[PDB]
PDB file of C-alpha atoms in Angstrom:
ATOM      1  CA  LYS A  67      -0.496 -72.819  29.861  1.00 19.88           C
ATOM      2  CA  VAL A  68      -3.977 -74.057  30.736  1.00 17.50           C
ATOM      3  CA  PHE A  69      -6.451 -71.182  30.774  1.00 17.83           C
ATOM      4  CA  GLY A  70      -9.252 -70.848  33.272  1.00 17.89           C
ATOM      5  CA  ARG A  71     -12.595 -70.464  31.535  1.00 19.61           C
ATOM      6  CA  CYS A  72     -13.188 -66.824  32.484  1.00 22.37           C
ATOM      7  CA  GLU A  73      -9.438 -66.126  32.043  1.00 22.93           C
ATOM      8  CA  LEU A  74      -9.598 -67.112  28.365  1.00 20.54           C
ATOM      9  CA  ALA A  75     -12.928 -65.351  27.845  1.00 19.62           C
ATOM     10  CA  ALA A  76     -11.261 -62.121  28.938  1.00 19.60           C
ATOM     11  CA  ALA A  77      -8.068 -62.760  26.927  1.00 21.12           C
ATOM     12  CA  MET A  78     -10.226 -63.485  23.910  1.00 19.30           C
ATOM     13  CA  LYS A  79     -12.250 -60.281  24.457  1.00 19.05           C
ATOM     14  CA  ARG A  80      -9.085 -58.232  24.877  1.00 17.35           C
ATOM     15  CA  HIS A  81      -8.043 -59.695  21.496  1.00 18.23           C
ATOM     16  CA  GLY A  82     -11.193 -58.743  19.609  1.00 19.24           C
ATOM     17  CA  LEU A  83     -12.759 -62.208  19.417  1.00 17.53           C
ATOM     18  CA  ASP A  84     -16.079 -61.104  21.060  1.00 15.72           C
ATOM     19  CA  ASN A  85     -18.620 -61.033  18.218  1.00 13.21           C
ATOM     20  CA  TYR A  86     -15.988 -61.161  15.463  1.00 10.51           C
ATOM     21  CA  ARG A  87     -17.811 -62.193  12.271  1.00  7.03           C
ATOM     22  CA  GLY A  88     -20.896 -62.257  14.496  1.00  6.78           C
ATOM     23  CA  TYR A  89     -19.598 -64.929  16.889  1.00  7.14           C
ATOM     24  CA  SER A  90     -20.260 -63.985  20.517  1.00  9.82           C
ATOM     25  CA  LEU A  91     -17.532 -64.683  23.080  1.00 10.83           C
ATOM     26  CA  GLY A  92     -19.441 -67.771  24.239  1.00 10.66           C
ATOM     27  CA  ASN A  93     -18.905 -69.523  20.922  1.00 10.70           C
ATOM     28  CA  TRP A  94     -15.166 -68.929  21.017  1.00  9.93           C
ATOM     29  CA  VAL A  95     -14.672 -70.113  24.575  1.00 11.18           C
ATOM     30  CA  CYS A  96     -16.831 -73.172  23.830  1.00 10.96           C
ATOM     31  CA  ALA A  97     -14.813 -73.912  20.723  1.00 11.98           C
ATOM     32  CA  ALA A  98     -11.628 -73.882  22.813  1.00 12.39           C
ATOM     33  CA  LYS A  99     -12.934 -76.145  25.540  1.00 13.49           C
ATOM     34  CA  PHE A 100     -13.547 -79.197  23.363  1.00 16.63           C
ATOM     35  CA  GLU A 101     -10.796 -78.554  20.811  1.00 17.23           C
ATOM     36  CA  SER A 102      -8.020 -78.049  23.373  1.00 14.50           C
ATOM     37  CA  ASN A 103      -9.553 -78.054  26.875  1.00 16.53           C
ATOM     38  CA  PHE A 104      -8.099 -74.556  27.306  1.00 14.19           C
ATOM     39  CA  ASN A 105      -4.547 -75.958  27.026  1.00 10.06           C
ATOM     40  CA  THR A 106      -2.369 -73.826  24.748  1.00  7.93           C
ATOM     41  CA  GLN A 107       0.256 -76.520  24.088  1.00  6.94           C
ATOM     42  CA  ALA A 108      -2.254 -79.044  22.683  1.00  5.80           C
ATOM     43  CA  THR A 109      -1.356 -80.868  19.477  1.00  5.22           C
ATOM     44  CA  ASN A 110      -3.047 -83.697  17.569  1.00  5.40           C
ATOM     45  CA  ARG A 111      -1.803 -85.681  14.580  1.00  5.60           C
ATOM     46  CA  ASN A 112      -4.492 -86.195  11.997  1.00  7.45           C
ATOM     47  CA  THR A 113      -4.751 -89.154   9.582  1.00  8.40           C
ATOM     48  CA  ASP A 114      -3.813 -86.896   6.645  1.00  9.32           C
ATOM     49  CA  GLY A 115      -0.357 -86.256   8.237  1.00  6.96           C
ATOM     50  CA  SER A 116      -1.220 -82.666   9.210  1.00  6.32           C
ATOM     51  CA  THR A 117      -1.227 -81.555  12.829  1.00  7.46           C
ATOM     52  CA  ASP A 118      -3.580 -79.396  14.878  1.00  8.98           C
ATOM     53  CA  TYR A 119      -1.982 -76.900  17.267  1.00  7.83           C
ATOM     54  CA  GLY A 120      -2.906 -74.655  20.176  1.00  8.15           C
ATOM     55  CA  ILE A 121      -6.061 -73.513  21.984  1.00  5.44           C
ATOM     56  CA  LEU A 122      -8.143 -73.561  18.795  1.00  4.68           C
ATOM     57  CA  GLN A 123      -6.472 -76.673  17.315  1.00  4.52           C
ATOM     58  CA  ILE A 124      -5.407 -74.888  14.149  1.00  2.39           C
ATOM     59  CA  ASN A 125      -4.379 -77.193  11.301  1.00  2.00           C
ATOM     60  CA  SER A 126      -1.111 -77.322   9.330  1.00  5.48           C
ATOM     61  CA  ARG A 127      -2.728 -78.246   6.004  1.00  7.69           C
ATOM     62  CA  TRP A 128      -3.558 -74.575   5.426  1.00  7.44           C
ATOM     63  CA  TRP A 129      -2.886 -72.159   8.247  1.00  6.95           C
ATOM     64  CA  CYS A 130       0.567 -72.556   9.796  1.00 10.19           C
ATOM     65  CA  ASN A 131       3.982 -73.963   8.907  1.00 12.46           C
ATOM     66  CA  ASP A 132       5.399 -77.065  10.645  1.00 12.27           C
ATOM     67  CA  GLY A 133       7.645 -78.226   7.801  1.00 11.22           C
ATOM     68  CA  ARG A 134       6.276 -81.786   7.670  1.00 12.30           C
ATOM     69  CA  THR A 135       2.928 -81.419   5.881  1.00  6.05           C
ATOM     70  CA  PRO A 136       3.525 -82.331   2.175  1.00  6.37           C
ATOM     71  CA  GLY A 137       1.869 -79.819  -0.149  1.00  9.23           C
ATOM     72  CA  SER A 138       0.562 -77.559   2.610  1.00  6.95           C
ATOM     73  CA  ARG A 139       0.205 -73.757   2.752  1.00  7.09           C
ATOM     74  CA  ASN A 140       0.995 -71.168   5.444  1.00  6.61           C
ATOM     75  CA  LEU A 141      -2.012 -68.913   5.195  1.00  6.48           C
ATOM     76  CA  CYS A 142      -1.547 -67.149   8.563  1.00  3.05           C
ATOM     77  CA  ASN A 143       2.198 -66.633   7.888  1.00  4.18           C
ATOM     78  CA  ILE A 144       3.328 -68.264  11.144  1.00  4.92           C
ATOM     79  CA  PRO A 145       5.186 -71.298  12.306  1.00  5.58           C
ATOM     80  CA  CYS A 146       2.697 -73.630  13.930  1.00  7.53           C
ATOM     81  CA  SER A 147       4.841 -73.312  17.097  1.00  5.99           C
ATOM     82  CA  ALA A 148       3.535 -69.765  17.702  1.00  5.05           C
ATOM     83  CA  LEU A 149       0.028 -71.273  18.127  1.00  7.93           C
ATOM     84  CA  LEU A 150       1.285 -73.108  21.248  1.00  5.06           C
ATOM     85  CA  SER A 151       2.293 -69.861  23.009  1.00  5.09           C
ATOM     86  CA  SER A 152       0.861 -68.840  26.372  1.00 10.41           C
ATOM     87  CA  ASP A 153       0.089 -65.474  24.748  1.00 10.14           C
ATOM     88  CA  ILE A 154      -2.824 -66.263  22.434  1.00  8.19           C
ATOM     89  CA  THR A 155      -2.380 -63.336  19.977  1.00  6.94           C
ATOM     90  CA  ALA A 156      -1.362 -65.596  17.073  1.00  8.01           C
ATOM     91  CA  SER A 157      -4.005 -68.212  17.858  1.00  8.96           C
ATOM     92  CA  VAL A 158      -6.507 -65.329  17.627  1.00  9.81           C
ATOM     93  CA  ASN A 159      -4.962 -63.589  14.614  1.00  8.79           C
ATOM     94  CA  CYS A 160      -5.165 -66.768  12.626  1.00  7.48           C
ATOM     95  CA  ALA A 161      -8.638 -67.695  13.965  1.00  6.64           C
ATOM     96  CA  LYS A 162      -9.891 -64.276  12.851  1.00  5.61           C
ATOM     97  CA  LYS A 163      -8.616 -65.371   9.437  1.00  7.37           C
ATOM     98  CA  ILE A 164      -9.908 -68.947   9.449  1.00  9.43           C
ATOM     99  CA  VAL A 165     -13.390 -67.750  10.374  1.00 10.57           C
ATOM    100  CA  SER A 166     -13.377 -65.313   7.402  1.00 13.15           C
ATOM    101  CA  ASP A 167     -12.703 -68.052   4.776  1.00 16.35           C
ATOM    102  CA  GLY A 168     -16.406 -68.670   4.003  1.00 15.73           C
ATOM    103  CA  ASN A 169     -18.038 -71.235   6.296  1.00 16.57           C
ATOM    104  CA  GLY A 170     -17.714 -69.467   9.645  1.00 16.65           C
ATOM    105  CA  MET A 171     -16.897 -71.487  12.760  1.00 22.32           C
ATOM    106  CA  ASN A 172     -17.972 -74.685  10.987  1.00 21.55           C
ATOM    107  CA  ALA A 173     -14.266 -74.915  10.081  1.00 22.92           C
ATOM    108  CA  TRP A 174     -13.905 -76.155  13.722  1.00 22.40           C
ATOM    109  CA  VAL A 175     -15.571 -79.562  13.673  1.00 22.64           C
ATOM    110  CA  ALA A 176     -15.810 -79.651  17.485  1.00 23.90           C
ATOM    111  CA  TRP A 177     -17.664 -76.318  17.228  1.00 23.11           C
ATOM    112  CA  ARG A 178     -20.098 -77.601  14.670  1.00 22.03           C
ATOM    113  CA  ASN A 179     -20.682 -80.728  16.756  1.00 21.69           C
ATOM    114  CA  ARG A 180     -20.591 -79.543  20.369  1.00 24.99           C
ATOM    115  CA  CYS A 181     -21.199 -75.768  20.451  1.00 21.66           C
ATOM    116  CA  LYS A 182     -23.412 -74.927  17.477  1.00 17.71           C
ATOM    117  CA  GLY A 183     -27.019 -74.272  18.637  1.00 13.91           C
ATOM    118  CA  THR A 184     -26.358 -74.828  22.341  1.00 13.55           C
ATOM    119  CA  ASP A 185     -26.663 -72.206  25.092  1.00 13.65           C
ATOM    120  CA  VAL A 186     -23.152 -70.946  24.508  1.00 11.46           C
ATOM    121  CA  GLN A 187     -23.682 -68.033  26.888  1.00 13.75           C
ATOM    122  CA  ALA A 188     -23.096 -70.553  29.679  1.00 15.09           C
ATOM    123  CA  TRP A 189     -19.358 -70.377  28.928  1.00 16.03           C
ATOM    124  CA  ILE A 190     -19.153 -66.698  29.832  1.00 16.55           C
ATOM    125  CA  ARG A 191     -21.672 -66.920  32.662  1.00 17.89           C
ATOM    126  CA  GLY A 192     -20.583 -65.013  35.744  1.00 20.16           C
ATOM    127  CA  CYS A 193     -17.230 -63.924  34.426  1.00 19.65           C
ATOM    128  CA  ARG A 194     -16.034 -60.356  34.835  1.00 23.80           C
ATOM    129  CA  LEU A 195     -15.473 -58.810  31.407  1.00 22.37           C
TER     130      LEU A 195
END
């Protein structure tokens, strides 16, 4: 599923992502845009053999199990496949965890590079919430 901007914003809000760890909804929606372009089935193979999955491009090195990442861990206790679901509950559950690891949303490079500092409110502008 490809989410519409305001559609994800709402789904995210429903799921407790609005201002979690102090990150307004705008940040989260912005993170998703560049990471995945709102597409839930997005994957990307990194140079280190791990793979990013889902709307928030969550990595297999640490956070989910895909059975082909030598020496990895399954912090969020899920198969990576769950992160590609149209229902974003697991993408959120694990993101709530990733963001609590110590460095905030900086764990999402695309966030650090393309969202951090910018008028992130623009991504929730004129949505019903």
